[PDB]
Each structure stands twice: as C-alpha cells, then as structure tokens.
Amino acid sequence: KQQGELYMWDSIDQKWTRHFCAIADAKLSFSDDIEQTMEEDNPLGSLCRGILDLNTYNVVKAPQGKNQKSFVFILEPKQQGDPPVEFATDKVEELFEWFQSIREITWK
C-alpha cells in the first residue's frame, strides 16, 4: 500500500502546504495542513479533507519542476473545468515511487 506525507499547491495563498496522503483502491486521499491543524490546536483537523478518483485523472511529471519545488507530479483531469491538483515531494526517489503507483492505476 502506498502512503506518506506530500506537499500540495494551494493556488490561493500561493504556497506549498504539507498533507498526509494515501492510496486505496483507485482513490487518493489528503488531509488538512498537518502544520496548522497544529498551529491552531484544532481537532476538527481532519485526516481526510478530500478524496480524488484517480480513474478520472491522469499523471504527468514536471521535468522543470514548479513553484520553487524540484520534484513534482500533477494530476490533470478528464472533465474540463476541473483544475489540476499539484503535488510535490522532498526526495527524488519518493517522486518516482508515487508516479509509479498512480500510473500503475490510471493505465490499469
């Protein structure tokens, strides 16, 4: 089973935030900012603020990187006006391990 911490791009605050993610079936889950939920002592602080159906998405890797992070992958969707969800990781090895897991699922 694939799971660990990941960075996510918030197109609002224009910053990366740290979220804990997991892959079960064809679904990728991500929790709330594990830094804040801490900064606010907040226990509605959830371990599952969102769930993505990988069946509806595709995975591209971003060679040049993005927004000052070196290793990122992007889940770009099928239905149009849905936005891309942009993830990034610390070490290059982790990147290739997620990219593998996710594609070993979008290409069945």
Dihedral over Cα of 62, 80, 9, 56: its sign: negative
Q: How far apart are CA 46 and CA 42, in angstroms?
A: 9
Specify the DSSP class assigned to residue 31.
-
Domains in the chain: how many in total? Answer: 1
Whether 50 contacts 57, CB under 8 Å = no
What are the CA-CA distances from residue 66 to residues 87, 88, 90 (Å)?
A: 10, 9, 13
Tokens 């090895």: give the residue.
93
Resolution of the structure, angstroms: 2.8
Specify the DSSP class assigned to residue 34.
T
The residue segments making up the domain with residue 72 are 1-108
Q: How far apart are CA 105 and CA 4, in angstroms?
A: 18
Here the tokens at position 62 are 């971003």
- What CATH number should be reported for the domain holding residue 75? 2.30.29.30
Q: How far apart are CA 80 and CA 66, in angstroms?
A: 22
Distance of CA 91 to the CA centre of its chain: 15
Q: Is 50 exposed, middle or buried (0-12, 13-18, 19+ CB in 10 A)?
A: middle
CA angle 76, 32, 67 (to 5 degrees): 50
Here the tokens at position 30 are 């991500």
CA angle 1, 43, 53 (to 5 degrees): 35
Q: Which ranges of 1-108 would DSSP assign to H, the alpha helix?
A: 36, 92-106
19 CB neighbour count, 10 Å cutoff: 21
Type and span of the H or E element at 86: strand 85-89
Here the tokens at position 93 are 């090895």
